[PDB]
Design a protein around this motif. Sequence first.
Motif, PDB file in Angstrom:
ATOM      1  N   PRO A   1       0.813  -1.221   0.000  1.00  0.00           N
ATOM      2  CA  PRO A   1       0.000   0.000   0.000  1.00  0.00           C
ATOM      3  C   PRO A   1       0.846   1.270   0.000  1.00  0.00           C
ATOM      4  CG  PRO A   1      -0.924  -1.588   1.515  1.00  0.00           C
ATOM      5  CD  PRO A   1       0.370  -2.180   1.026  1.00  0.00           C
ATOM      6  N   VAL A   2       1.782   1.367   0.940  1.00  0.00           N
ATOM      7  CA  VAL A   2       2.673   2.514   1.052  1.00  0.00           C
ATOM      8  C   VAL A   2       3.923   2.186   0.245  1.00  0.00           C
ATOM      9  CG1 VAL A   2       3.955   4.024   2.589  1.00  0.00           C
ATOM     10  CG2 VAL A   2       1.737   3.110   3.298  1.00  0.00           C
ATOM     11  N   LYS A  24      -0.259  -8.191  -4.703  1.00  0.00           N
ATOM     12  CA  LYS A  24       0.083  -9.111  -3.623  1.00  0.00           C
ATOM     13  C   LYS A  24      -0.768  -8.867  -2.382  1.00  0.00           C
ATOM     14  CE  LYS A  24       3.059 -11.282  -6.012  1.00  0.00           C
ATOM     15  NZ  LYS A  24       2.822 -10.417  -7.201  1.00  0.00           N
ATOM     16  N   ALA A  25      -1.066  -7.603  -2.069  1.00  0.00           N
ATOM     17  CA  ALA A  25      -1.898  -7.301  -0.911  1.00  0.00           C
ATOM     18  C   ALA A  25      -3.358  -7.669  -1.134  1.00  0.00           C
ATOM     19  CB  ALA A  25      -1.782  -5.819  -0.553  1.00  0.00           C
ATOM     20  N   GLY A  26      -3.821  -7.674  -2.381  1.00  0.00           N
ATOM     21  CA  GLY A  26      -5.198  -8.019  -2.672  1.00  0.00           C
ATOM     22  C   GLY A  26      -6.178  -6.957  -2.226  1.00  0.00           C
TER      23      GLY A  26
ATOM     24  N   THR C  26       2.890  -9.448   6.519  1.00  0.00           N
ATOM     25  CA  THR C  26       3.337  -8.757   5.321  1.00  0.00           C
ATOM     26  C   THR C  26       3.496  -7.262   5.593  1.00  0.00           C
ATOM     27  OG1 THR C  26       2.831  -8.308   2.998  1.00  0.00           O
ATOM     28  CG2 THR C  26       0.985  -8.449   4.532  1.00  0.00           C
ATOM     29  N   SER C  28       1.590  -4.905   4.668  1.00  0.00           N
ATOM     30  CA  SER C  28       0.303  -4.285   4.958  1.00  0.00           C
ATOM     31  C   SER C  28      -0.289  -4.737   6.288  1.00  0.00           C
ATOM     32  CB  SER C  28      -0.684  -4.563   3.821  1.00  0.00           C
ATOM     33  OG  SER C  28      -0.846  -5.955   3.612  1.00  0.00           O
ATOM     34  N   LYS C  30      -0.745  -7.862   7.507  1.00  0.00           N
ATOM     35  CA  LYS C  30      -1.607  -9.026   7.376  1.00  0.00           C
ATOM     36  C   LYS C  30      -0.796 -10.298   7.586  1.00  0.00           C
ATOM     37  CE  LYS C  30      -2.804  -8.591   3.167  1.00  0.00           C
ATOM     38  NZ  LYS C  30      -3.622  -8.817   1.948  1.00  0.00           N
ATOM     39  N   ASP C  64      -1.123  -1.082   7.067  1.00  0.00           N
ATOM     40  CA  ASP C  64       0.111  -0.468   6.587  1.00  0.00           C
ATOM     41  C   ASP C  64       0.162   1.011   6.945  1.00  0.00           C
ATOM     42  OD1 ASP C  64       2.516  -0.018   5.370  1.00  0.00           O
ATOM     43  OD2 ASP C  64       1.788  -0.244   3.312  1.00  0.00           O
TER      44      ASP C  64
END
Lengths: 70, 271, 67, 88, 129, 104
Positions: A1-2, A24-26, C26, C28, C30, C64
Motif C-alpha cells: 500500500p505505502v 500481492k496485498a489483494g 506482510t 500491509s 496481514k 500499513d
Amino acid sequence: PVIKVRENEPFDVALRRFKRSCEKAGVLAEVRRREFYEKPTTERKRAKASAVKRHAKKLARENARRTRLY
Amino acid sequence: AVVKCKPTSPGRRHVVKVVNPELHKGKPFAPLLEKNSKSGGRNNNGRITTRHIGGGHKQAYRIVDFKRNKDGIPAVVERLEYDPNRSANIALVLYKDGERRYILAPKGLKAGDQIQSGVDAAIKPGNTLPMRNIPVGSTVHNVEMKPGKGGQLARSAGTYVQIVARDGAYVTLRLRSGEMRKVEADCRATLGEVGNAEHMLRVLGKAGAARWRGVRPTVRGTAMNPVDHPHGGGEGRNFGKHPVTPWGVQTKGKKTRSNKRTDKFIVRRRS
Amino acid sequence: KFCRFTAEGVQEIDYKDIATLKNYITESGKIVPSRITGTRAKYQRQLARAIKRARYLSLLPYTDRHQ
Amino acid sequence: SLSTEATAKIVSEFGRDANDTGSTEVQVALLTAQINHLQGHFAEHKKDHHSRRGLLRMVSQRRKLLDYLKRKDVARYTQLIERLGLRR
Amino acid sequence: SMQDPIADMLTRIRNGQAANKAAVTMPSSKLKVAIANVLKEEGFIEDFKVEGDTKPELELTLKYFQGKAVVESIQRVSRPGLRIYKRKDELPKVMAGLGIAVVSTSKGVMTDRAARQAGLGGEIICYVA
Amino acid sequence: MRHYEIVFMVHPDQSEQVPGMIERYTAAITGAEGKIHRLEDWGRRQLAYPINKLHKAHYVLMNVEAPQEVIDELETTFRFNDAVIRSMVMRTKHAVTEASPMVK
RNA sequence: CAAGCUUGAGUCUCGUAGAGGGGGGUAGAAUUCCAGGUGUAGCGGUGAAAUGCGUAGAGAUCUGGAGGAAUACCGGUGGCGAAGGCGGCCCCCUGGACGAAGACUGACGCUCAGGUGCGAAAGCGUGGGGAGCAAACAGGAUUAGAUACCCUGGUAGUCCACGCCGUAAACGAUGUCGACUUGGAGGUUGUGCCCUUGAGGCGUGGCUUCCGGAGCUAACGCGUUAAGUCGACCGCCUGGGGA
RNA sequence: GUUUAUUAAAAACACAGCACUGUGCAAACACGAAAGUGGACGUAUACGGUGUGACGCCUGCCCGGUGCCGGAAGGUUAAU
Ligand SMILES: [Mg+2]
Ligand SMILES: [Mg+2]
Ligand SMILES: [Mg+2]
Ligand SMILES: [Mg+2]
Ligand SMILES: [Mg+2]
Ligand SMILES: [Mg+2]
Ligand SMILES: [Mg+2]
Ligand SMILES: [Mg+2]
Ligand SMILES: [Mg+2]
Ligand SMILES: [Mg+2]
Ligand SMILES: [Mg+2]
Ligand SMILES: [Mg+2]
Ligand SMILES: [Mg+2]
Ligand SMILES: [Mg+2]
Ligand SMILES: [Mg+2]
Ligand SMILES: [Mg+2]
Ligand SMILES: [Mg+2]
Ligand SMILES: [Mg+2]
Ligand SMILES: [Mg+2]
Ligand SMILES: [Mg+2]
Ligand SMILES: [Mg+2]
Ligand SMILES: [Mg+2]
Ligand SMILES: [Mg+2]
Ligand SMILES: [Mg+2]
Ligand SMILES: [Mg+2]
Ligand SMILES: [Mg+2]
Ligand SMILES: [Mg+2]
Ligand SMILES: [Mg+2]
Ligand SMILES: [Mg+2]
C-alpha cells in the motif's frame, strides 16, 4: 500500500512496484466481494463448491497423466 | 418486584404493585421528620395556579441530605424507607460518631453497606466527591449545579447523568433528558444510579389510585364552554381550531423558553 | 509440521518476541497464511493469537498506513 | 468440576479403604457435591443451557445409580441418604 | 448394546465365510460351545478350540469345499424379541432334510433328526443350510 | 495461587515516577501474598499506532503469582488511573522467570 | 431366587485441543452524523436516463467530537457442540471429548409410548437503543400494462434485558447402541520407541474428507462414519387431488 | 361514581391505560403594575397542556392550504 519511490528510480518501474504490491496485498479483490452482501448460506455454498472443484481438478490432472501416451 | 394482581374485581383487574421486601416496616426516624401540609394548588392569594391538584393522603416531610459535604468520616447505611414526598427510596445512613441522615438510595446499595463522602473517597456507588476526581464516562446521580447548593440533577426513581467531557474548569455531562450541559468542576455528585428503577412499571389501576396520589381529574377543553375554554362550544363533538392552552398559547410544537441567562451552559438542545 | 520450529523447539510463540514474529506479517500488516508459511495447524493458530496480542499491545500495526 | 483436594477428601471420607475411587457411595457423594456446587452457579447464569444439560445428565446418572444401590441392597442406601441429605 | 451372543456368533461366522476367513475368533460361552459342537458334528465347520482362563474365546475354523463356502445360509430363527417353541411333531425341516435346525431341548442342544428320534421337542435356535 | 502476567504502558510525561508505581504494585502484591517472580521495565519506546495523540510510551511487564482478588483490584486501579494507558493481563499456567526477547 | 467375574457401563489420578455456553471490560479498520478549515460546478446512479444531493458551497480533502453493529489477514470439505449454532483480545464461573500407566463398583447396560427440556430465522409484549442494511411505503425508470426485477429515500425489523409461539429443504431428505466384513490417498488432535542431522521412520488411539473391491439398490449411488449380513427399541408409510 | 339545587341522572363529565408537545430549575405555566407565591421544600421514571379513554386485532395514504419547527442564499422592511 505505502510505496515510496527510491532514489533515482524510473517512473515505469516505480509504478510497476506499486502495482505488484497492490496485487500481492489483494486490495482490488476485497472491494469486489465487500461491495454487496453475501449471506452465510451462500458463502458456505461457494466455499464448499470451490473446495470440491479444487479437489476434483487436481485429482483429474493427476489421474490423466497415466494414460494417453501422447 | 412487580406483582400482577388477581382480577377479583374491577379496579383490581389491572393493578400491578412494585414491591420491595427490603423496605423497613414501622415508624420512620422521628428526629428527622417535619411537617408538610397540602398546598392544594393555591398560592398566597387563594387562587388556583396549578389545577388538578388536591386531596390525597397525609404525608410528612423527611429531611433528606442532598449535599453530603462531610469530608472524612465514612458512614454505614442501616435500612431503607419509602419516602411519600418523592418517587425514590431513602436510606438511613448513620456515621461512626452518632449522627443519622437520609440519603438517596443508589442502585446496588443494600442494608449494611458503607459509604464515604469527601474528595478523598473511593469510586463506589454511594460515595460523593467533586467532578475533578470522578473519571470520565461515569454514571453519577444527584448532581449539583453550583458548589454547595445541593444535588438537583437526576434524583428521581431511576435517573442518572453520564459524564462525557471535562476540560478543566467545566465538565460536560449528558442529562436524563438527552442534552449535554457544562457544570462547574467543583460540583459534587453521588456515584451510580438511584435504586428503585421499576417505579415506571407500576399502574394505578383505578381512578381512586390517582386521588390517592393527590391529583384531581383533568377535564378536556373540547367538552367545556367557549367562555370556560377556547376549545369549548359546539352542537356535538366539534373541534375546529388549533390545539392551544386555556390561556391562548399554542400547545403542539410551541417552544416556551426565554431564559437567556442560562444559555452559555447548554451545549445542545434536547432531541 | 512446524517448519520454522523443528530445529528450535520453542513450542510456544510469545507475543513479546517481535524479531522472529514480524516475518509472519506482510508489509500491509496481514498474517501470511499457513498455506504459504508451511506452519503446523496448532503453531499457526497460536501464532495468530500472539500477533493479535501484539497488535493490541501496539507491538505490531493493524494496517500499513494506520492513520 | 471439584478440585483435587476436595475430591480426595470426599473419596477418603466416603470410601471403605480410602482408595476405592469409584465405589457407589463415592460416586454418589461426588455427584451430589458437584450438583450442590453448581446450584450457586445456576442462579446468576440461568441462560447457561450448555451446562444445564450436563447437570441434568449428572442428576440422571445419580438417580439411576441410587436406584441400582437400593435394588441391590438396602442397607447403606438408607444410611447414605441420611448422611448426604438427598430427599430420596 | 450386545443383546444376543448367539446372533453375534452367527453374524461373525457368516461374515468369515463371506470374506474367506480361515478361522473366526470371538468371546465364547457355554451355549456357544454347545452350538459349535453341533456345527462340527455335521461338517459345517472344520473344528474349534476354547482358549482362555478368565475370558474364554472360541476360535472356529471354517471349511471351504471347492472354493465355495460349505454353509449356504445360517438364519437366526428364535431371536430375543420373539421366542419360538415347537413340539416334537412340529419341528421344521430345512431344505426338505438337506439342512439342519438346531434345537435346545431338555436333553441338550441337538439337531432335528436327534430330537425326532428321541421323541421330544424344544425351542429352535437357528437354521443352517 | 494462579499465575498472572501484567504488561502495561503509561505516558511519557510521568516516566520518572514509574518506579514508584512499580514499588506500590509489588508492595500490594506481597501484602496480598503474591509471589512476584519476574518484573522488568522496557523503558520508553515508540508505538505501532498513535494512542491518545502520542507516539512513544513506556512499557512495564510483571509476571507474578497473585490471587484473583488482588488481580481484580490491580485491574480496577489501572482502569481508574489515567497515567496508565493500556494494561493487558494474561493467565499463565507456569511461573516463567526468563528474560524477555526485548531486554536481551 | 442367592452367590460369584470383568470384557459392557460409570469413577479416580495427569496432561491435550477446541468460534462449547453464560457474565463483565478493552483496541483498531470501516459506515453515518455534528463543528471547524482549504477548496469550486458538479456529486450520485444506470445497458442508457431521471427521481435524489448541489452556488444556502454539494462531492473531495484534513482536524476534533457523537453513536450503533460486526470483528479485515489468520480461515481450512479446520475445530467444538445432541441439534439449532458458535470467529478480535482479556478476565470470572462452567459443560463436554481424547490418550500414556495404574486399582475398585460389579450388569449398575440399550431404547422409549405419555412427560419434561433445548431449539435457526421470521413474529408478538414491556423498557431502551438505532450507525449501516432493509419488508410496508414515496418518487424515477423499462415495458402494451410492471402493484416486480433496476435506481433515489425510507418505517417495523435487524441490536440489548426479561417475557410469548415452537415453526424450516431444523438435510447426510439416512432415528440410538453393540460387534462382525478387502484397501489407497489425506486433514486435525494425543501417545511408545528409535542416532529426532528436515514436517526422520516404525505402531497405536479419537474426529473427519475423497476414491473404491465384495456386498446391496429399480438406478443414481452407499461402501468399516455402509444404503453389506444381524441383534434391542421407538416413530412413520398403504394411489394422486380434496388437505 | 359525578352532572344541570327547583321539569333533562343519560349515550353527557371523570377515570386507570395510550399518544403528542414544552419544560435543565432562578424550569414551563398561573395568580400578581412589583415584591412574592403555587408548581415544589419536587428534579425528565417529575411537572403542565392537548387529544382518545379498561382490554383483544390495528392507527392505512396525502403537507395542495392554515398552524409548529429548522435555515438566513436572495427581495422588502420600523425606530435610529
Ligand atoms: Mg394536570
Ligand atoms: Mg389524563
Ligand atoms: Mg360533549
Ligand atoms: Mg364563569
Ligand atoms: Mg375565547
Ligand atoms: Mg368546543
Ligand atoms: Mg355543545
Ligand atoms: Mg358534528
Ligand atoms: Mg369540518
Ligand atoms: Mg388564540
Ligand atoms: Mg473445560
Ligand atoms: Mg415423545
Ligand atoms: Mg429473532
Ligand atoms: Mg437503503
Ligand atoms: Mg431498495
Ligand atoms: Mg422487539
Ligand atoms: Mg415439521
Ligand atoms: Mg427431515
Ligand atoms: Mg435417548
Ligand atoms: Mg464432532
Ligand atoms: Mg465410493
Ligand atoms: Mg352508577
Ligand atoms: Mg330527575
Ligand atoms: Mg419559587
Ligand atoms: Mg370521549
Ligand atoms: Mg383503545
Ligand atoms: Mg390517522
Ligand atoms: Mg412543504
Ligand atoms: Mg421561521
